[PDB]
Design a protein around this ligand. Structure first.
Ligand SMILES: O=C1CCN(C2C[C@H](O)[C@@H](CO)O2)C(=O)N1
Ligand SMILES: O=C1CCN(C2C[C@H](O)[C@@H](CO)O2)C(=O)N1
Ligand SMILES: O=C1CCN(C2C[C@H](O)[C@@H](CO)O2)C(=O)N1
Ligand SMILES: O=C1CCN(C2C[C@H](O)[C@@H](CO)O2)C(=O)N1
Ligand SMILES: [Zn+2]
Ligand SMILES: [Zn+2]
Ligand SMILES: [Zn+2]
Ligand SMILES: [Zn+2]
Lengths: 130, 130, 130, 130
């Protein structure tokens, strides 16, 4: 399961998206240490603040199943460049993923930006601050 | 899969909860029309606003898998009476579940309150308002 | 400051709304015991989950100023019937307002629904449950 | 109104915080181009996902008043190093503040980190992506 294959997983996950308000579908694929893949997609609500992102869906899914050790996260959306995770998602990612997990950001045109969880949100607010 | 059995599913789901900040674990079990069960649990974050509830986790899981027709939702937590879904969750539930889906609320001491999605949040803000 | 006058405050507050994504402006006016009025409006974000509602904006404003005793809350939006506070807002309201606070819901066509904070979200999840 | 004076505003704002769950008070002070200051503080909820941050409170306050041109944002909390805005707040900030706005991060022990909105969340998901 290389990053290209994980990207294909995220591209498939994207098609499950429930985004009738923004019409902006996002897909995510989370790869665990053991090689299992969890797909995620954004799920919206008439009350916008309740919308849930693809990255979060995938992580919530994995964690709820007892899978907490990840190696890579791919995210895909039809954006100009590699899709940029929103601040809230970066926060969830920084909490649920170890700092060296690889985050693969892409769009639907082959643009690829790869970074670590740490780079995704440097000095991210964390439990240590509490 | 009667409500007692769905409650047991939610009680098991509750044990997967990641709630180190509130130390308040919540479990949810979503039953689809075809009889499949999706378990959910709350997942917290050092940045409190990012916490995700059990009900949402279960629904996000189901919807991301393509399951969108539900018949019952059980929610369990160690509260004095049947656990009360927070407003945000009631909003997500009112969006992702049809009005006649049965919501079974319970705690860890047999208290049971049963209501419909409609009763859970009467006149809930919806897409029609937009 | 009767409810009709508070409604006019909410209507004015609505015009301050920053909602370029939904194009759905909401206004809120919070009346304190001492008779001071705090206006609120929804403020959106490209990342939908970050959108903030009018009711919340007004309450956050009042509380941040040290005002914590309220008597009435008016909410207005261009909806078919009286605007229905989203679940998240009902949750914030149930926390920051006493159960006796009057919530006046209206649209831009004179439809008015009045209820208490308790009635807005009966049995709302609260600190006592934690 | 230099940054030291804005920091003192944030420190005062912090004392208005309503954070009975985390017991973690945060303060924010937003300086407009015209030199007006808006104070913000975090306001929590029994339902954690409903918690609102100091930075957001200040910005919501300013925007609701019609003030939309800012020059500096100070944030203070009792953290080990300069307080780190959570991802959600960085997202709100990247939307409501121009990329040149100066963000002053500090704690209660004189540690100060200064950066631009762009640096706070480089390549932040934005409307252009939608
Ligand atoms: O973090 C990324 C960027 C934001 N989107 C979302 C949620 C929402 O349904 C839509 C518009 O914000 O894209 C994601 O799903 N993931
Ligand atoms: O709607 C219900 C009530 C709220 N809790 C949550 C989220 C959070 O981790 C914790 C404290 O609010 O309980 C749920 O998980 N479900
Ligand atoms: O609770 C009510 C219903 C929801 N709206 C919002 C936030 C968002 O900008 C827009 C669409 O959900 O209306 C409010 O401002 N208040
Ligand atoms: O972005 C920063 C970091 C997070 N805190 C918050 C909200 C919440 O009440 C508390 C714990 O997350 O700190 C802020 O107020 N601002
Ligand atoms: Zn996101
Ligand atoms: Zn909830
Ligand atoms: Zn709302
Ligand atoms: Zn924050």
């Amino acid at each position: 399961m290389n990053r290209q294959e994980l990207i294909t997983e995220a591209l498939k996950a994207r098609d499950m998206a429930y985004a009738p308000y923004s019409k902006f579908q996002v897909g995510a694929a989370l790869l665990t240490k053991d090689g299992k893949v969890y797909r995620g997609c954004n799920i919206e609500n008439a009350a916008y603040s309740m919308c849930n992102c693809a990255e979060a869906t995938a992580l919530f899914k994995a964690v709820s199943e007892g899978d907490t050790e990840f190696q890579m996260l791919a995210v895909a959306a039809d954006t100009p460049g590699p899709v940029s995770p929103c601040g809230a998602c970066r926060q969830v990612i920084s909490e649920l993923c170890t700092k060296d997990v690889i985050v693969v950001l892409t769009n639907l045109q082959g643009q690829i930006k790869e970074m670590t969880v740490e780079e995704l949100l440097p000095g991210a607010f964390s439990s240590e601050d509490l």
